């Protein structure tokens, strides 16, 4: 019941799709893989584990890296430097206390100097054009947690895993919008846990049926069926923290039902 | 590019950076500069300068400065944005002698609350709303500036920076120590700034925290379970903290009608849930009547 909090649901789906990355970049970049993209991120989620920063922050990063290779194209070599500077602008804009530049040049092992990694942080404001306050999956879940009935922690911390999940792979996750992937997250969790699917105010609040979020939830709930097996094992064992309520110790349900 | 700007004098520094008047030789505009140089930074471009650029460039309203470009110099950044007149602090300290005309406090009131309920909406925090981050023009116009201390929110909150708000215009919740602060806060200080446009003078001039808490104690009363729901819970809250009847707020700015005191005290409510948004102060009685004068001196 917050206030505006309709008012800033329709405004962040339209941010939304304004700071959508193209679908399609990772094809158009000649030395970068999904691979490479998807070490990258497990990378950014250790460093967020490590310096306890905001989810929030996390899923800020991602978003600057995908829109800034959207338009750059980048050398293998270059990528971390890439991660590395959005994370730090991530941080400066979303915690109170973001690590100081040198423990970023720290984490990258030496890879590159202070100098490089401010000169980054430079370009990257100008590729996104200072436009840094993207709407995240992160966002979307903490408004359609509040439709719980009762809320539960189990539900809460299942979904933002698996909407973090989503983060790792390009393909196929660069095709759903934040507030789709956190739909689909959000009954994925709330079915795993409780049996209970997305509700009908949710439907009301966001146009969003079960039949939409189809796609979405097939694609979702494979990744949460492989997870293990996935050769990324960052977020996983995050999750297994009591601090996320050790969700990602839950068995995924073997079908959905749909 | 810096070189059509042609530059006027230094009006002063903002929450960060340093401000100046300029003017557009190509286009005639007049506009303020804020110069934030890079050069002692060592941290790269600061938090503040992040904040206040990504946020003003989504928030075109006219009652919130307009951010009209941003140039990277060699080690500077240059924040234009358009140039407005005067600050309402200077404003106020002007009109000592023959105060400042009820249309003139109830079109700016209107106007702020316009301003404010167009950040609430597109999810931005301001969190230094005092007069002199209020600036107004020669036709009427008064608008939110210095965005310094902004932030995007979530809904529902989290924990943010706990050193917010110049203390005067500070509310209750932040000084008490609640691990969540909204919108509330924000209409707060807007509050503080009605009853300053009245009388003239800060209603809550404290010179600490505590201070600070009993001077807003000691004329709103002491707040207890009744008034604010988890009060004695919080975090700062003290059993020891003198008890205080509040007070008429007829008594609290005398010169202030029925519908004034009204959408005051409502302004300044204890508890955030209960204190008014700028957006439901809109339709408040107190503005049935507003138009939007000039302002009686000249700036
Ligand atoms: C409080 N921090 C601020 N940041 C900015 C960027 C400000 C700003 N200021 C103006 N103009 C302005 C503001 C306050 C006072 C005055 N005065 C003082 C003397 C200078 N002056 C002349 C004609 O020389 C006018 C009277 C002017 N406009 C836009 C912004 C913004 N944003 S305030």
Redesign the interface.
């Known amino acids: 019941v917050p206030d505006y909090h309709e008012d800033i649901h329709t405004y962040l789906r339209e941010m939304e799709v304004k700071c959508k990355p193209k679908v399609g970049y990772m094809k158009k970049q000649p030395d970068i893989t999904n691979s490479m993209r998807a070490i990258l991120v497990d990378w950014l989620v250790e460093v967020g584990e490590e310096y306890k920063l905001q989810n929030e922050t996390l899923h800020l990063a991602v978003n600057y890296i995908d829109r800034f290779l959207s338009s750059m194209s980048v050398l293998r070599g270059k990528l971390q430097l890439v991660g590395t500077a959005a994370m730090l602008l991530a941080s400066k804009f979303e915690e109170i206390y973001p690590p100081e530049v040198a423990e970023f040049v720290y984490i990258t092992d030496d890879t590159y100097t202070k100098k490089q990694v401010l000169r980054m942080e430079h370009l990257v404001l100008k590729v996104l054009t200072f436009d840094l306050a993207a709407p995240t999956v992160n966002q979307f879940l903490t408004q359609y947690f509040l439709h719980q009935q009762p809320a539960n922690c189990k539900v809460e911390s299942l979904a933002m895993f698996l909407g973090e999940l989503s983060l790792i792979d390009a393909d196929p996750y660069l095709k759903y919008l934040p507030s789709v992937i956190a739909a689909a997250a959000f009954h994925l969790a709330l079915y795993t846990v409780t049996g209970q699917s997305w509700p009908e105010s949710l439907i009301r609040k966001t146009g969003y049926t079960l039949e939409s979020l189809k796609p979405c939830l097939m694609d979702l709930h494979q990744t949460y069926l492989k997870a293990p097996q996935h050769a990324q094992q960052s977020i996983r064992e995050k999750y297994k923290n009591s601090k996320y309520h050790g969700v990602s110790l839950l068995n995924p349900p073997e079908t959905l039902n749909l | 590019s810096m070189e059509n700007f042609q530059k006027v004098e230094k009006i002063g520094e903002g929450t960060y950076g340093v401000v100046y008047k300029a003017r557009n030789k190509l286009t005639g505009e007049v506009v303020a500069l804020k110069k934030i140089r890079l050069d002692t930074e060592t ?5 503040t300068a ?2 206040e ?3 003003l ?2 928030l075109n309203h006219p009652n919130i400065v307009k951010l009209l470009d ?1 140039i ?1 110099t060699e080690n500077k950044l240059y924040l234009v944005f358009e140039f407005l007149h005067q600050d309402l602090k200077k404003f106020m300290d002007a009109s000592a002698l023959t105060g400042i005309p009820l249309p003139l406090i109830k079109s700016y009131l209107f106007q702020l609350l316009q301003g404010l309920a167009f950040c ?4 931005v925090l301001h969190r230094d709303l005092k007069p002199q981050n209020l600036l107004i023009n020669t036709e009427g116009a008064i608008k939110l500036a210095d965005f310094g201390l902004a932030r ?1 929110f ?8 706990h050193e917010v708000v110049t203390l005067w215009y500070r509310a209750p919740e932040i000084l008490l120590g609640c691990k969540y602060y ?2 509330a806060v924000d209409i707060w200080s807007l509050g503080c700034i009605f009853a300053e446009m009245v009388t003239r003078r800060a209603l809550f001039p404290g010179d600490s925290e505590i201070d600070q808490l009993f001077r807003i104690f000691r004329t709103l009363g002491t707040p207890d379970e009744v008034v604010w729901p988890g009060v004695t819970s919080m975090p700062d809250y003290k059993p020891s903290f003198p008890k205080w009847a509040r007070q008429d707020f007829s008594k609290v700015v005398p010169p202030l009608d029925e519908d004034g005191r009204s959408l005051l005290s409502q302004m300044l409510h204890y508890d955030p849930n209960k204190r008014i ?1 700028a ?2 102060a809109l339709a408040h009685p107190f503005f049935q009547d507003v138009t939007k004068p000039v302002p009686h001196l000249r700036l």
């Open positions: 941290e790269g471009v600061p938090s992040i904040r650029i990504s946020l460039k989504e941003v990277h609430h909406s597109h999810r995007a979530g809904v529902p909150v989290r924990t943010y920076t909204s919108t948004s957006k439901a």
